[PDB]
Amino acid sequence: SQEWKEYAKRVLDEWQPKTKLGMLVKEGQITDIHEIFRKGYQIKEPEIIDVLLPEVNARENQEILDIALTVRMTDSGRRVRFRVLAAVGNRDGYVGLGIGHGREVGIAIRKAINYAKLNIIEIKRGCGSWECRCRRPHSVPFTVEGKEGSVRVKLIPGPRGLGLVIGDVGKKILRLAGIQDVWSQTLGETRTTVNFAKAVFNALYNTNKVVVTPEMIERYGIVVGRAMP
Template sequence: MNFNMEEWEPRTNLGRLVKEGVITSIDEIFEEGHPIMELEIIDALLPDLEEEVIDVNLVQRMHKSGRKVNFRVIVAVGNRDGYVGLGQGKAREVGPAIRKAVDDAKFNLIKVRRGCGDWGCVCGREHTVPFKVSGKSGSVRVTLIPAPGGVGLAIGDVGKTIMRLAGIDDVWSHTRGQTQTTVNFARATFDALKQLSKVKASEKDLKNLGVCST
């Protein structure tokens, strides 16, 4: 669905500031810690987000009127340049479930720290993770390790999709647990990327690692 700025009628003060051009970057919102309550804000500031369906599954539950069957969909969104989100949606049909998952992923959008964190690589580009970090979900634990340029994405297919959407070209990884559980693998990978912003480092160290200040 194409976003039309002219037809958008903001319902929040933050939305009005975006539409009026007072706020022109998603970074301004993240840095101030403002909650995003309207999807149109993300559509306006990050119009180039791509969507990838990670997993589609049938889920059943018993109800007094009988067995209820829904589709559960996991979707990742990203602009391949430092922003990525992961979301889930449920509905009786696949299409609406995907739409819900995409919206959820946009609300869960994060900015990913990137750099040149491998000491054997001095290219200075933002092509890998700047630090070793780990994330977990359920029994799955994913550790991301900086890699030199040209290594590629040494991680499972689900992780590859999330890394590409985040704009990471090279990474080593180590996984533990039931990694064949797609949902937990995706969430653990996403959690590891979230941990990047929590690592404390001096401006000098960040500059040496090729990380742009956030």
């Protein structure tokens, strides 16, 4: 994990902010990722995360779902541009997702890889299926659901070891956050890879929309972000 600390000294000196949060990370007060989120700041410059999540750029926390070209007409023929769906996040607890556009497949991919650096959000975890009574973050804690477009889906815990079981453009974006074993009930139309992606990721957001009282914390081993490096 060396290079992904060398990048900190490579980057922190080679950039001046244009926003404010830029400063409040550049000058040594806030230096730990998990204390910038739950306060309603704004993320507009895509380096603040790199300076604290410097493994997001590793070509392995990065995943590229699909390229799809779209068309429109003008009175001089066709005009055509690409959209790629790209998601990223370290393989510990944090994931982000972006679309982007552009007129060439490169510019598209890079633009999207950048957009998906800002939205990035964090999770909870657990193990609370009726079998894995263990307490180690290898499954989503409690059955929750999320909606988008014309697709609903509700995730269910499951025992340590049952391999990922969801559609083929869900296995990636579940693998990134490392959620390994989880069972799937689908509705709607799973053939627009986009709304699929966005609905799954929305559910994983909603993971933090239910109140778990003090005691239940030590029933499923809920965590937040990294746990036991």
